[PDB]
Amino acid sequence: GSSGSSGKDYWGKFGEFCHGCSLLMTGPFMVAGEFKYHPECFACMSCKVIIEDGDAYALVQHATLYCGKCHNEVVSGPSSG
Numbered sequence: 001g002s003s004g005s006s007g008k009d010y011w012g013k014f015g016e017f018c019h020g021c022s023l024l025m026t027g028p029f030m031v032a033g034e035f036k037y038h039p040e041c042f043a044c045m046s047c048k049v050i051i052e053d054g055d056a057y058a059l060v061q062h063a064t065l066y067c068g069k070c071h072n073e074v075v076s077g078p079s080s081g
């Protein structure tokens, strides 16, 4: 298996860039977890489903993001354990 891709400016930090790609944005964006992302890059870490402006996202105590349906396992609220 192979991978290895780069291109992330160190300099030029005035505008806003999707945290996930470091590329500059111009149109609409989403804000959560005190970060910034392209409207196409705010997704459940594990499953990759794109979250939209209203779909229930979930945050973790660490740099991670999940969907409300699946973060359900990390909380176990109405379950036994």
Ligand SMILES: [Zn+2]
Binding pocket: 018, 020, 021, 038, 040, 041
């Ligand atoms: Zn992006």
Ligand SMILES: [Zn+2]
Binding pocket: 044, 047, 049, 066, 067, 069, 070
């Ligand atoms: Zn999910």
